[PDB]
Amino acid sequence: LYDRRSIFDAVAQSNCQELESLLPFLQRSKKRLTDSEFKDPETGKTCLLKAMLNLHNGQNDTIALLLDVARKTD
Known part of the structure; x- marks a missing residue:
């Protein structure tokens, strides 16, 4: 299960496995x-x-994850 706080914390920490x-x-x-x-x-x-707004060395792997999810869902 997911909610706003969990997704926000995951992308802030850049943990793709949580997503x-x-x-x-x-x-x-x-x-x-x-x-x-x-x-x-x-x-x-x-x-x-x-x-x-949370990039580490100019990188955040969760951005592509979110874009792919948005592509696939609706």
């Missing part, structure tokens, strides 16, 4: 990664913007 089950989670739940559950309630930022 391995994100695609089947979304496909079983039948809800989009762009839905309001995953945006911040106040700023409106999404997990991609959280990932982009």
Whole structure:
């Protein structure tokens, strides 16, 4: 299972293994990664913007993971 806080912490730490089950989670739940559950309630930022603001040596492997998940889901 996943929620906004878990995804945000995973992309902040750049742990791709925590996000391995994100695609089947979304496909079983039948809800989009762009839905309001995953945006911040106040700023409106999404997990991609959280990932982009946390780069280590100019790298963050979770960005491609999120883009592929967004491609595959809806």
